[PDB]
Amino acid sequence: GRLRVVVLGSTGSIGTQALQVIADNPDRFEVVGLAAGGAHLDTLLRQRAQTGVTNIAVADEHAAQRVGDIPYHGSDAATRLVEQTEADVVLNALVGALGLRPTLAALKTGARLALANKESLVAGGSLVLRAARPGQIVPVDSEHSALAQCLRGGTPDEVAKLVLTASGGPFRGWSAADLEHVTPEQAGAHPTWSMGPMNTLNSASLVNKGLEVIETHLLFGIPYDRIDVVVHPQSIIHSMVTFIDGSTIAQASPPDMKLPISLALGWPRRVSGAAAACDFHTASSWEFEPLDTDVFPAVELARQAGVAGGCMTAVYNAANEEAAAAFLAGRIGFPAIVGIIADVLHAADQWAVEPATVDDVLDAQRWARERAQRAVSGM
Amino acid sequence: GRLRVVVLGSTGSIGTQALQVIADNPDRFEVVGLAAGGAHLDTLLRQRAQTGVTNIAVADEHAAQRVGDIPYHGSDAATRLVEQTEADVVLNALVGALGLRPTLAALKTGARLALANKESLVAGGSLVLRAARPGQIVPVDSEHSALAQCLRGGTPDEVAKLVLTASGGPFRGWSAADLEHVTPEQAGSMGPMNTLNSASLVNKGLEVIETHLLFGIPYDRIDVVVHPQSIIHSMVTFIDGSTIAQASPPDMKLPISLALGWPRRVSGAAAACDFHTASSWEFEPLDTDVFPAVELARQAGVAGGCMTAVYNAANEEAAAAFLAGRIGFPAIVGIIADVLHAADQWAVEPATVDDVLDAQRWARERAQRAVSGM
Ligand SMILES: CC(=O)N(O)CC[C@@H](c1ccc(Cl)c(Cl)c1)P(=O)(O)O
Ligand SMILES: [Mn+2]
Ligand SMILES: [Mn+2]
């Protein structure tokens, strides 16, 4: 039958791609809610006109006053929309901190949560896990989507290892000496139109992969010592699972986010024609190589944060956001990003306590941000 | 919860590796029967001593005599062992045509048939399928084991394509002119027939037919890709564009162990891919001009009935002539084609084992006729 879908973050890359999948598949999906920030208010208003969906939310009060007929407006607009809208699936594609409360509200309604928002798991951790019931959260990103599919290859008890693939970034194979010279431009600083400026840099620094490893632990309940990373420059294999008998099951497709988005929306049922398949009529190779963890320690650091638990992964991520922004601003060199994360993390053991509230998560993030600022400035 | 296993073809490669899997896993598996041809009495005698199993079948009467006191001996010994031994799993690793009757006997007992003898399914066709319940036949072949695992990635209605990987053999990339000069040594662990069939691409053709029969997927949705490393063992493409693939360093103990204990995986059966060191998995299209054995397999399979029995039997005779030094390498697949072209009457579905045997008898004769013309 038809799934009723709420799209939170409807004007970003994931949300707009999801709306395309939904427009292509009216027999499978109907939009019953849209939420956005207000920075792209014009897009949201066009979406209302196009879909006919009037059940919309705008977070920015200032933006909302340009309109006069938006039912949900102001800081917790998305949350209130989620609380009051009958839906089968909530796609949470909101950015950063504003994803957390709508995640918690989505879980409470009993809807399936198709989760793109990284902060919900990386920062919210045990708050989100204690709120979700088994199978409720379906991951939207390609690696986690790949893992969910490969885990079908056996029972939970038959799993030996999860292996996430990583592109390796623009500096794959670079030495420590090479990294010293890295400029914001080289590391992917471009005013690109849809994605965020952090995404390309987090890829380059291996911090993105670190974040994906944390999310993997929380999504699938696999110990950190059983979550490996391999560099795979083609990004065709999106991740793999090794079972206790020696068998490895991998998911492969040409890079296209409509695949994992369509599957998250329809889970557990695949959406016919979502993406193009691998074509073996032409010759290709799929290459694998180890990550040099001496040059790129961001994943080791993520495992350290994850094992410590509580709010430590919130600290990891907040330290990154601050350090990464300082590098793009010319305040630090490239290797200093992960260097500052390590230094902030090693001072952060007070945050190993489990959060009781969203406010507790916010407090850890505040401390981490300030601590990282002090590291950058020399204070 | 111990599974009682009968091992047919125990002295060959698959047979010996299965005994190793069973020996490493006494809590899951127990050998209750052994069958062999009698050409490797040293191995069989060691197997009796090591397993303690005296419930043994030896095909060759003279060889069984040289051992003495064998409970089952002569051409139908393996079949009789199957009929009379209580078991949960029959591993049929017999080679070529002698596998058919034991396969049919095994299915009739209700036991799981862990099938390494693909000939019995390729030749048996619908006769074998009608004898089996759903899931009774569990493939030992690495490609089919991989497909079975990958099919867990969705529901039957979500399957778009099955993709069989092929090593390419030692003559990958070679021209038709190059193949004229191939010697039996150049086309030489699995067995002289299996090694040759890998080189000629007839093994892949046989595996294409096996796939259709095992999984019920149309021939025009079974694809072959050349993958030199043989680490990816096969893949399934689903309707959304996702492909699920199975990968491991080549080691038959993995698919053997899974076949014996299906659906349950056997801890430590084989080594996993090591992603702490670099590797590359290469893919290339098959050269269907130089190697048309796979397309001929599809043509035989589509024709159906006893036509797949013809394909296999014609191969067995031409292959034997090549190994004897009587014909050249490219003539093997040439003869299969000529024989299939003449095989009009064999599109009829086998009602009994006798129909299959009639088809094979004719195919062997027609193959010899083709050899004589060279
Ligand atoms: C081992 C197996 O399944 N075979 O049938 C042997 C033949 C196949 C083969 C050849 C070599 C290797 Cl290493 C493997 Cl795993 C498989 P081919 O792709 O050449 O037909
Ligand atoms: Mn990703
Ligand atoms: Mn095979």
Nearest CB neighbour to A245, from listed B155, B249, B266: B266
Q: Return the residue of B nearest to A242 by Cα.
A: B272
CA distance A283 to A264: 31
The answer on B218 and B105 residing in a single domain is no
Q: Report the CATH number at residue A35.
A: 3.40.50.720
Biggest CA–CA distance in chain B, Å, is: 61
Q: B249 to chain A: which residues are within 8 Å by CB?
A: 246
CA of B296 to nearest chain A CA: how many angstroms apart? 19
Helices (H) and strands (E) in chain A, counts: 16, 12
Name every residue whose Cβ is closer than 8 Å to that of residue A23 and which is 6 or more positions away in sequence. Answer: none
**Are residues A286 and A161 located together in one domain of the fold?**
yes
DSSP 8-state assignment for residue A96: G
Same domain (yes/no): B2, B75: yes
Count of Cβ atoms closer than 10 Å to residue B2 Cβ: 12
| B144 CB within 6 A, ligand 1 | no
User: Experimental method used, please?
Assistant: X-ray
Phi, psi of A107 (to 5 degrees): -65, -40
Query: Tokens standing for B32?
Result: 């209750």
Is B142 a pocket residue for ligand 1 (Cβ < 6 Å)? yes
Domain co-membership, B271 together with B309: no
Residue A56 pairs in a beta bridge with: A34
Which residue's C-alpha comes closest to atom 10 of ligand 1?
Answer: B167
Residue A181 burial (C-beta neighbours within 10 Å; 0-12, 13-18, 19+) = exposed
CB pairs A-B closer than 8 Å: 155
Residue B267 shares a structural domain with residue B151: yes
Resolution, in Å, please? 2.0
Q: B79 alpha carbon to ligand 3 midpoint, in Å? A: 24
A149/B268 Cβ within 8 A: no
**Cβ contact A149–B258 (<8 Å):** no
In total, how many domains does chain A have?
3
Q: List the beta strands (DSSP E) in chain B.
A: 3-8, 29-36, 56-58, 72-73, 89-92, 112-115, 137-139, 159-166, 222-226, 232-238, 243-247, 279-285
Residues A147 and A283 in one domain: yes
Q: Which of B94, B115, B141 is the last residue of a domain?
A: B141
Tokens of A111: 């809807």
How far is B90 from chain A, CA to nearest CA, in Å?
Answer: 21
Q: Are residues B171 and B199 in the same domain?
A: yes
- The domain in which residue A196 lies consists of 142-292
Same domain, B301 and B338: yes
End-of-domain residue from the set A141, A160, A192:
A141
- Ligand approaching nearest to the C-alpha of B170: 1
Residues A118 and A187 in one domain: no
**Are residues B273 and B301 located together in one domain of the fold?**
no
Alpha helical stretches, state H, B216-352: 253-261, 293-303, 307-324, 330-341
A39 has a chain B CB within 8 A of its CB: no
DSSP helix/strand/coil, B165: strand
Touching check for A225 and chain B: CB below 8 Å?
A: no
Ligand 3 centroid–CA B233 distance in Å is 9
- Among positive and negative, which fits the CA dihedral B288, B291, B294, B296? positive
Q: HSE on the CB side for A59, CA within 13 Å?
A: 21
The whole-angstrom distance between A53's CA and the closest CA on chain B is 27
Q: How is chain B split among helix, strand and coil, in percent rounded to 5?
A: 50, 15, 35
Q: How many Cβ atoms sit within 10 Å of the Cβ of residue A374?
A: 15
Using alpha carbons, select from B258, B276, B141, B367 the residue that is nearest to residue A243: B258
Helix (H) or strand (E) holding A4: strand A3-8
Handedness of CA A284, A290, A291, A294 (dihedral sign): negative
For residues B175 and B98, membership in a common domain is answered with no
Query: Which of B249, B266, B287 is a domain's end point?
Result: B287
Distance from CA of A69 to the nearest CA of B (A): 39
DSSP string for B69-108: --SEESTTHHHHHHHHS--SEEEE---GGGGHHHHHHHHH
Q: Is A194 exposed, middle or buried (0-12, 13-18, 19+ CB in 10 A)?
A: exposed
Element (H, E) at A160: strand A159-166
Q: Do A369 and A318 fall into the same domain?
A: yes
Compute the distance between CA of residue A144 and CA of residue A259 in angstroms, rounded to an integer: 12
Q: Is the CB of B167 under 6 A from ligand 1?
A: yes
Put simply, the answer to whether A153 touches B158 (Cβ < 8 Å) is: no
With CB atoms and an 8 Å threshold, state whether B149 touches A247: yes
Structure tokens at A38: 């207000």
- The crossing angle, in degrees rounded to 10, of helices A207-220 and A335-346 is 50
Q: Which residues of B touch A226 (CB under 8 A)?
A: none
**If we measure between CA atoms, which residue out of A232, A228, A247, A230 comes closest to residue A285?**
A232
Q: What is the CATH number of the domain that holds A322?
A: 1.10.1740.10
